Amino acid sequence: TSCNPSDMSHGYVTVKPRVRLHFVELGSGPAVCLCHGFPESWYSWRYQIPALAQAGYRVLAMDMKGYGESSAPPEIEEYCMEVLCKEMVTFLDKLGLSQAVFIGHDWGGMLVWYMALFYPERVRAVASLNTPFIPANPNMSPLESIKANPVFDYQLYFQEPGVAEAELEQNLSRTFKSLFRASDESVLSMHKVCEAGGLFVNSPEEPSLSRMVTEEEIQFYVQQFKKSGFRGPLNWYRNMERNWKWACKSLGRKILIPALMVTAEKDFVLVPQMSQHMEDWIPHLKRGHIEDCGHWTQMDKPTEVNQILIKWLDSD
Numbered sequence: 001t002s003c004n005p006s007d008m009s010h011g012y013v014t015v016k017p018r019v020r021l022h023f024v025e026l027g028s029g030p031a032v033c034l035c036h037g038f039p040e041s042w043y044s045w046r047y048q049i050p051a052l053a054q055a056g057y058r059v060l061a062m063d064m065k066g067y068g069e070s071s072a073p074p075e076i077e078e079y080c081m082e083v084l085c086k087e088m089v090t091f092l093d094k095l096g097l098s099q100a101v102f103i104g105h106d107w108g109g110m111l112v113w114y115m116a117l118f119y120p121e122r123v124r125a126v127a128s129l130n131t132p133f134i135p136a137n138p139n140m141s142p143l144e145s146i147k148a149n150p151v152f153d154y155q156l157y158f159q160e161p162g163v164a165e166a167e168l169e170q171n172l173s174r175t176f177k178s179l180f181r182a183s184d185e186s187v188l189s190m191h192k193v194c195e196a197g198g199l200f201v202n203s204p205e206e207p208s209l210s211r212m213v214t215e216e217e218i219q220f221y222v223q224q225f226k227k228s229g230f231r232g233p234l235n236w237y238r239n240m241e242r243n244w245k246w247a248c249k250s251l252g253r254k255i256l257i258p259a260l261m262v263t264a265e266k267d268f269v270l271v272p273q274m275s276q277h278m279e280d281w282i283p284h285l286k287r288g289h290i291e292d293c294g295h296w297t298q299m300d301k302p303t304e305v306n307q308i309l310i311k312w313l314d315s316d
């Protein structure tokens with residue numbers, strides 16, 4: 001049901017000089033690669049690694065670049081989609097892996113999406129939790145698509161180096177106790193974060209422990225964000241220009257490999273309606289849906305999650 005880090009097989013792979021990637025491996029069979037979201041760790045797949053291995057799979061759960069035991073280079077440009085995706089491929093190469101299944105959640109959702117577009121020969125199959133695939137529009141700058149959706153106002157507060165960093169890093173134990181909750185325990189409003197001066201502004205001094213997590217697991221995340229900081233994780237937000245430009249090349253291409261889109265009903269930012277037309281560009285796309293389910297899907301509803309994937313991995 002869970003995973004003891006000191007009971008794992010720990011692996012590391014240098015993909016570039018200052019850049020080594022660490023992961024956790026378990027099981028045999030076809031190779032599955034799990035890529036986490038923000039601000040998390042391979043540990044947030046702790047309910048899915050073991051169930052997946054038992055279904056007959058070679059599972060590799062990752063510390064995405066900038067997190068945990070993976071390297072956190074100081075340059076923002078190192079964090080754009082095009083640079084990260086290529087490093088995934090070098091990753092597969094140095095293990096003798098010709099192809100793989102990729103399954104991403106949140107930001108990791110977007111990464112898994114760029115692989116099936118640009119490197120579909122190494123991608124056996126692709127799946128995403130929350131994150132929808134929406135083709136860029138060549139005539140809407142990214143800062144415009146923020147005007148028309150102020151739910152995303154928080155991205156601007158994130159753009160300035162230093163600022164957002166200070167808030168999340170002053171008291172780490174409060175940050176994760178504040179963030180990792182279910183929708184009905186929420187202590188954040190994404191409405192005018194830029195104006196109010198931050199996120200943890202209307203949030204109590206001593207948050208209560210939510211129902212979903214233990215006082216240990218908060219310590220786990222707390223200690224991982226002690227070596228690297230929040231500079232790395234926040235920079236995944238600050239490459240919107242290049243990502244629009246690179247992405248513009250996909251126009252016309254259609255992913256044709258086996259695919260699956262899974263939405264959650266209490267994610268009020270990565271909202272389900274945002275994927276309504278993903279079938280026009282992905283003709284083979286299967287779907288799933290979960291209810292009562294917020295953002296931290298795997299932690300809230302792990303059994304629903306496990307059943308949907310495993311039924312889909314064995315379908316094709």
Ligand SMILES: COc1cc2c(cc1OC)[C@H]1C[C@@]3(C)C[C@@H]2C[C@@](NC(=O)NC2CCN(C(=O)C4CCOCC4)CC2)(C1)C3
Binds near residue numbers: 182
């Ligand atoms: C309910 O209230 C919540 C609100 C949030 C979160 C949890 C919540 O509790 C439940 C957490 C924490 C944070 C700090 C703020 C916000 C949202 C958080 N996640 C996020 O910002 N992910 C980004 C990467 C993937 N993105 C896309 O792929 C495309 C881009 C263009 O098209 C639209 C989707 C865009 C967003 C995920 C970031």
